[PDB]
Design a protein around this nucleic acid. Structure first.
Ligand code: SF4
Ligand SMILES: [Mg+2]
Ligand SMILES: [Mg+2]
Ligand SMILES: [Mg+2]
Ligand SMILES: [Mg+2]
Ligand SMILES: [Mg+2]
Ligand SMILES: [Mg+2]
Ligand SMILES: [Mg+2]
Ligand SMILES: [Mg+2]
Ligand SMILES: [Mg+2]
Ligand SMILES: [Mg+2]
Ligand SMILES: [Mg+2]
Ligand SMILES: [Mg+2]
Ligand SMILES: [Mg+2]
Ligand SMILES: [Mg+2]
Ligand SMILES: [Mg+2]
Ligand SMILES: [Mg+2]
Ligand SMILES: [Mg+2]
Ligand SMILES: [Mg+2]
Ligand SMILES: [Mg+2]
Ligand SMILES: [Mg+2]
Ligand SMILES: [Mg+2]
Ligand SMILES: [Mg+2]
Ligand SMILES: [Mg+2]
Ligand SMILES: [Mg+2]
Ligand SMILES: [Mg+2]
Ligand SMILES: [Mg+2]
Ligand SMILES: [Mg+2]
Ligand SMILES: [Mg+2]
Ligand SMILES: [Mg+2]
Ligand SMILES: [Mg+2]
Ligand SMILES: [Mg+2]
Ligand SMILES: [Mg+2]
Ligand SMILES: [Mg+2]
Ligand SMILES: [Mg+2]
Ligand SMILES: [Mg+2]
Ligand SMILES: [Mg+2]
Ligand SMILES: [Mg+2]
Ligand SMILES: [Mg+2]
Ligand SMILES: [Mg+2]
Ligand SMILES: [Mg+2]
Ligand SMILES: [Mg+2]
Ligand SMILES: [Mg+2]
Ligand SMILES: [Mg+2]
Ligand SMILES: [Mg+2]
Ligand SMILES: [Mg+2]
Ligand SMILES: [Mg+2]
Ligand SMILES: [Mg+2]
Ligand SMILES: [Mg+2]
Ligand SMILES: [Mg+2]
Ligand SMILES: [Mg+2]
Ligand SMILES: [Mg+2]
Ligand SMILES: [Mg+2]
Ligand SMILES: [Mg+2]
Ligand SMILES: [Mg+2]
Ligand SMILES: [Mg+2]
Ligand SMILES: [Mg+2]
Ligand SMILES: [Mg+2]
Ligand SMILES: [Mg+2]
Ligand SMILES: [Mg+2]
Ligand SMILES: [Mg+2]
Ligand SMILES: [Mg+2]
Ligand SMILES: [Mg+2]
Ligand SMILES: [Mg+2]
Ligand SMILES: [Mg+2]
Ligand SMILES: [Mg+2]
Ligand SMILES: [Mg+2]
Ligand SMILES: [Mg+2]
Ligand SMILES: [Mg+2]
Ligand SMILES: [Mg+2]
Ligand SMILES: [Mg+2]
Ligand SMILES: [Mg+2]
Ligand SMILES: [Mg+2]
Ligand SMILES: [Mg+2]
Ligand SMILES: [Mg+2]
Ligand SMILES: [Mg+2]
Ligand SMILES: [Mg+2]
Lengths: 99, 82, 137, 148, 208, 10, 122
RNA sequence: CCGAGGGUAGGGCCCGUGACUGGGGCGGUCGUAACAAGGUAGCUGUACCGGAAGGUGCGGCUGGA
RNA sequence: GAGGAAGAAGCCCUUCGGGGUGUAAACUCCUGAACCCGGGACGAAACCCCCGACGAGGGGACUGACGGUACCGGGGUAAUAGCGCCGGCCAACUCCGUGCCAGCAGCCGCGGUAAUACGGAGGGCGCGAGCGUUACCCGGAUUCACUGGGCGUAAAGGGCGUGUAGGCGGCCUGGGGCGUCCCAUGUGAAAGACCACGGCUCAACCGUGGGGGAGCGUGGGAUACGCUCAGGCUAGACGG
RNA sequence: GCUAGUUGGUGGGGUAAUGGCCCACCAAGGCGACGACGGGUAGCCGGUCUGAGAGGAUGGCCGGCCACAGGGGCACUGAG
């Protein structure tokens, strides 16, 4: 089936497009322990109806552009600015890690 | 087109084919679609021919073509005898 | 307090080695469920649902072997060995095919399942797997 | 009765104003091949004397070892500090898969199909003691149930 | 291939009588009956205590030497027993007993397994009618180890048959004499034989 | 690699 | 280290330094001798170990050992070398293989002829 | 229009090599710093000094009295 | 291959009586790899011709490089043995030569006149159309430690705090079912591996059959623990 | 720390077809310690070798897919 992923919107700075930060879990293939990785998909918002902090289901789709191959399938949970701050901060934390 | 052919296995001086369906253009012992029988043409045993006649009739119906010496063996254990 | 379970098991373990008649440990439904198995397998006499300054604990009544003659009297233990397998660090989760026989039979390996906190013999039997809580012998 | 095996014999030395004055140590296991076994470390101003003495102590200290047709009832792993011996049970198809110390103790214990391993320091004297107290800690479902 | 060369010396190395020769073996002209001591310049010398290695070495050697077989086939057989279902020490002994050049021996068609080989190889023997000339054939239970009926007219086979009128063969064998043929009824049991091989030892050896 | 008078060159 | 530590940093797989790098892969190599001499070895030995400085076909130049009694090797000898060092001759990390190229086997050698490139007598 | 590549000019990383120079590892000359309160307890960070070990100052440690 | 001496010669050792090679050999018979003669393949029944109908089915003919090879039948000669090792690990011990020389060497190390360690000899051990060596991989190495290690003094606690991300996190009850567990279903090609049966005289090799896993897709179920959402508590924590 | 067809947009060209694949314009994005960018090195897998297993090592031959045809670029013909 067409893959359906759930993540937050982390950027609405783009035209008819949003960024969806999707966590996922799994066990370590040698150390057992469960771990989270994550992945930013660029989603088609053909009617700029999605905002920041908006948890959304995005489904796989025929290509819309370079690196945009998923549309927002349904609003799931709106206003999670708490999960954004998470990302914004980690990202911003980088400024310190240069030389 | 698609075919019913003799994929050779076995050893040197040990022909043990596999009457098989594949695309005309594989390497002869290359990756086929389906196996539909064996055929030890040396007959060193009881059952040296084994055609799943059910399947041999399907492939024929969709469009498959057969080696002239495949029907030699498809006919021999009768696929066509109405 | 980070893992109550290994705590409990440790109170148990720390208790047996000094031969405390019983040992006190705070309470969860989950800890009774465990202790339930320990008793129903004869690792402990048993346990009561008691109270120190109005706080829900469990008194656990400890079992040992007989006195012994020689230079060291101390009774061999009932619980020789108990330790945590699954942990908040590394979660251990066995499916049924992969549930581990213990001590070639002699001990158990409690675990936790979609159909209750079973033993290992008991789970293979009932047909499920889950979170390898610990092991006792 | 009891068959012996010399398993380690070694010279040592103690210094004194005239030079090295030696002494010998003999480590000996003894049993029947049906279930009694003992180990004795014996030391004297002489080899065959000290061998004699160990054998006296070996027999003067023995162990249950519950069998089960040539093998043990359950796995067991015992550290005697630094030295850790592993005991695993095996079918009659196998053999006495051990180093020359664990083997020799377990042949007289009349074990005959067991898997072992010598992790840790493999000082013989200590691996020796570790295999004993390993056997010494074996139990059958019978006493396992008898405890509960 | 097979060893060849001085064979009294094997036994006297081995500290034990093996029946590698034939007639002489039972005679008191056997050198072992006279010199039950290791061959070469150091024979009568107050030997030094064996090593566990030596111990398992020698036990293996005798067991192969007994059958006069290549170190490689012996090992080849042995690993297969270990793969095969059930007791390895026995299944081994069984598997190397099922070897055609050895069957011809128990059945007494010849004196030594050495002599036996040559029979099978030359075609003088067969199995289930059809001639078979390989000393390695897995004699699989239900089988007719006849003489090549067209080589029955010979001074040696009759002769060893002459000497086999009523000795009780293996419990797993059925020597119908005169007709010059036996039958491999069932592969041997462990206790079903007592050669001087502590089979548990050949196992511990190959597990080094 | 080469040398004094050797046609060998190494 | 914790399980987390291990997830974060993994364990470090440890590599082996080859002791015959001049060999540049190969089982053996062909060389020509640039020097040929005797060398006295380290304590507690005392000898005149006979060696050879050798220009490999890799451009590399190593010094090799010459094993046995007497040898026919000299400046410009075409030579073949296997690895393996000599304990007391430090720097010498390779062995000259007798009976190959201008390396003679050893005359009058009966035992171990293989290791000395000597043909069997009659 | 783009375009293999050619040319020009300026940069970045790598390799090899270089008069000469710095220590580093392996196999007589000067003293005797360390090992015993080692003949000024020893070590230490730092600083200055001295053929060389090392000495001295300041503070620290005991693995010292 | 069966037999063949209280046991040749030569060689080795020795206390000078002997001891060893050694049933080994020479000899006795018996078989009969090579070669010699004869015969001699399956691998090839279809395309094609005929009757039927150019189909079903029936009938007949040509075609073999390997190759006059395999194999079968008769005849039939005693018919290659070599390499490593014998201080310890490690199975196998003596003399002579040599004298820190010459040389050995994987590590410990051996050799400075009595060397089981160097060279040869005898003998022994081990393998055998092979035996050794070099190169490289995994092994032993629980010496990168998930299974399955550690840090007072052996290598190893950051000089000390504060806190970001991250990891981890009390007791009770509800919702969800993401992790986790179970069943069904698809996929997990063939070869291989495995177990049984068979094929070439065995086997290597080779055929047929069986058994499947993990892992992913789909559907169903479970709800203890982990998660998440909601409500509650006071034993952690903070505060008066 | 990297990025100017860079990341998104609307239009169009191209194809058997989606797409910054290509062009014009407009918007200011896109990626990055869960390792971007850069440097080394390698065709990947079925398998193979080792190992009690976990793990390590490896991809010759047979099968499967990619890639290349002296070094490069190009398009024609064509179901391809
Ligand atoms: S037993 Fe007699 S004949 Fe058989 S081998 Fe030993 S010595 Fe030779
Ligand atoms: Mg678009
Ligand atoms: Mg004591
Ligand atoms: Mg310890
Ligand atoms: Mg050691
Ligand atoms: Mg040590
Ligand atoms: Mg008991
Ligand atoms: Mg004949
Ligand atoms: Mg092994
Ligand atoms: Mg010297
Ligand atoms: Mg020396
Ligand atoms: Mg020359
Ligand atoms: Mg030349
Ligand atoms: Mg240009
Ligand atoms: Mg340019
Ligand atoms: Mg040009
Ligand atoms: Mg430079
Ligand atoms: Mg001084
Ligand atoms: Mg001083
Ligand atoms: Mg002083
Ligand atoms: Mg001092
Ligand atoms: Mg100072
Ligand atoms: Mg001066
Ligand atoms: Mg001064
Ligand atoms: Mg001071
Ligand atoms: Mg120190
Ligand atoms: Mg005599
Ligand atoms: Mg004589
Ligand atoms: Mg004599
Ligand atoms: Mg003879
Ligand atoms: Mg034909
Ligand atoms: Mg007609
Ligand atoms: Mg002919
Ligand atoms: Mg051929
Ligand atoms: Mg013939
Ligand atoms: Mg002869
Ligand atoms: Mg060897
Ligand atoms: Mg030895
Ligand atoms: Mg000399
Ligand atoms: Mg040598
Ligand atoms: Mg001397
Ligand atoms: Mg000498
Ligand atoms: Mg040597
Ligand atoms: Mg010598
Ligand atoms: Mg061979
Ligand atoms: Mg290694
Ligand atoms: Mg490892
Ligand atoms: Mg290390
Ligand atoms: Mg290392
Ligand atoms: Mg660990
Ligand atoms: Mg350690
Ligand atoms: Mg360091
Ligand atoms: Mg330290
Ligand atoms: Mg500190
Ligand atoms: Mg936090
Ligand atoms: Mg959390
Ligand atoms: Mg909790
Ligand atoms: Mg689920
Ligand atoms: Mg498959
Ligand atoms: Mg067969
Ligand atoms: Mg199959
Ligand atoms: Mg709450
Ligand atoms: Mg567009
Ligand atoms: Mg468009
Ligand atoms: Mg682009
Ligand atoms: Mg543009
Ligand atoms: Mg703009
Ligand atoms: Mg990521
Ligand atoms: Mg490159
Ligand atoms: Mg490449
Ligand atoms: Mg291991
Ligand atoms: Mg390939
Ligand atoms: Mg190209
Ligand atoms: Mg070319
Ligand atoms: Mg080109
Ligand atoms: Mg070109
Ligand atoms: Mg064409």
């Amino acid at each position: 089936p067409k893959k359906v992923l759930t993540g937050v919107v982390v950027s609405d700075k783009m035209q008819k497009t949003v960024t969806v930060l999707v966590e996922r879990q799994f066990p370590h293939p040698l150390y057992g322990k469960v771990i989270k990785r994550s992945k930013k998909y660029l989603a088609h918002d053909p009617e700029e109806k999605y905002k920041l902090g908006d948890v959304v289901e995005i489904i796989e789709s025929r290509p819309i552009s370079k690196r945009k191959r998923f549309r927002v399938l349904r609003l799931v949970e709106s206003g999670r600015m708490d999960l954004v701050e998470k990302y914004l901060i980690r990202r911003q934390n980088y400024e310190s890690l240069s030389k | 087109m698609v075919k019913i052919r003799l994929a050779r296995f076995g050893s040197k001086h040990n022909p043990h084919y596999r009457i098989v369906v594949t695309d005309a253009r594989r390497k002869r012992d290359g990756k086929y679609i389906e196996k539909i029988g064996y055929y030890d043409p040396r007959k060193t045993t009881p059952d040296w021919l084994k055609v799943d006649v059910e399947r041999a009739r399907y492939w024929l119906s969709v469009g498959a073509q057969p080696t002239d010496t495949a029907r030699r063996l498809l006919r021999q254990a009768g696929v066509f005898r109405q | 307090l980070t893992d109550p379970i290994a705590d409990m098991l440790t109170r148990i373990r720390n208790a047996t080695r000094v031969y405390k008649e019983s040992t006190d440990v705070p309470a969860s439904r989950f800890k009774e469920e465990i202790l339930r198995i320990l008793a129903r397998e004869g690792f402990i006499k048993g346990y009561e649902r008691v109270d120190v300054d109005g706080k829900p604990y469990l008194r656990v009544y400890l079992k040992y072997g007989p006195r012994r003659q020689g230079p060291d009297p101390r009774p061999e233990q009932v619980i020789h060995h108990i330790r945590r397998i699954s942990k908040p660090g590394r979660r251990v989760y066995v499916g049924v095919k992969e549930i581990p026989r213990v001590r070639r039979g002699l001990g158990i390996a409690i675990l936790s399942t979609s159909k209750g906190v079973l033993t290992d013999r008991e789970a293979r039997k009932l047909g499920v797997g889950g979170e390898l809580i610990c092991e006792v012998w | 009765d009891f068959e012996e095996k010399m398993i380690l014999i070694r010279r040592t030395a103690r210094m004194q104003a005239g030079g090295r004055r030696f002494r010998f140590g003999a480590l000996v296991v003894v049993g029947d091949r049906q279930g009694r076994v003992g180990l004795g470390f014996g030391k004297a101003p002489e080899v065959p004397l000290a061998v004699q003495k160990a054998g006296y102590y070996a027999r003067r200290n023995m162990v249950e070892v519950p069998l089960q047709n040539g093998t043990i009832p359950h796995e067991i792993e015992v550290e005697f500090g630094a030295s850790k011996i592993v005991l695993k049970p095996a079918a009659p198809g196998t053999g006495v898969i051990a180093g020359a110390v664990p083997r020799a103790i377990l042949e007289l214990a009349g074990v005959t199909d067991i898997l072992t391993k010598e992790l840790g320091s493999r000082n013989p004297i200590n691996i020796a003691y570790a295999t004993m107290e390993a056997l010494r800690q074996l139990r059958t479902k019978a006493d396992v149930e008898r405890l509960r | 291939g097979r060893y060849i060369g001085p064979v009294c010396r094997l036994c006297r190395r081995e500290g034990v009588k093996l029946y590698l020769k034939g007639e002489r073996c039972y005679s008191p002209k056997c050198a072992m009956e006279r010199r039950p001591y290791p061959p070469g310049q150091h024979g009568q010398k107050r030997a030094r205590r064996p090593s566990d290695y030596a111990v398992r070495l020698r036990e293996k050697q005798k067991l192969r030497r007994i059958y006069g077989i290549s170190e490689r086939q012996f090992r080849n057989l042995f690993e297969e027993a270990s793969k095969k279902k059930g007791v390895t020490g026995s299944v081994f002994l069984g598997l190397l007993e099922s070897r055609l050049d050895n069957v011809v021996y128990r059945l007494g068609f010849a004196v030594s397994r050495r002599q036996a080989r040559q029979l099978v190889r030359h075609g003088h023997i067969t199995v289930n009618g059809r001639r078979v000339d390989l000393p390695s054939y897995r004699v699989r239970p239900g089988d007719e180890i006849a003489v090549a009926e067209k080589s029955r007219n010979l001074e040696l086979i009759r002769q060893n048959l002459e000497a086999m009128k009523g000795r009780k063969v293996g419990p797993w064998l059925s020597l119908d004499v005169e007709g010059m043929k036996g039958k491999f009824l069932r592969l041997p049991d462990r206790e079903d034989l007592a050669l001087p091989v502590n089979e548990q030892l050949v196992i511990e050896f190959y597990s080094r | 690699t080469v040398x004094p008078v050797x046609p060998y060159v190494x | 280290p914790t399980i987390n530590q291990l997830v974060r940093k993994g364990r470090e797989k440890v590599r082996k330094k080859s002791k015959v790098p001049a060999l540049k892969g190969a089982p053996f190599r062909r060389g020509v001798c640039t020097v040929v001499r005797t060398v006295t070895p380290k304590k507690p030995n005392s000898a005149l170990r006979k060696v050879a400085k050798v220009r490999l076909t890799s451009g590399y130049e190593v010094t090799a050992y010459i094993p046995g009694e007497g040898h026919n090797l000299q400046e410009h000898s075409v030579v073949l070398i296997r690895g393996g060092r000599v304990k007391d001759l430090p720097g010498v990390r390779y062995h000259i293989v007798r009976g190959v190229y201008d390396a003679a086997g050893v005359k009058d050698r009966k035992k171990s002829r293989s290791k000395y490139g000597t043909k069997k007598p009659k």
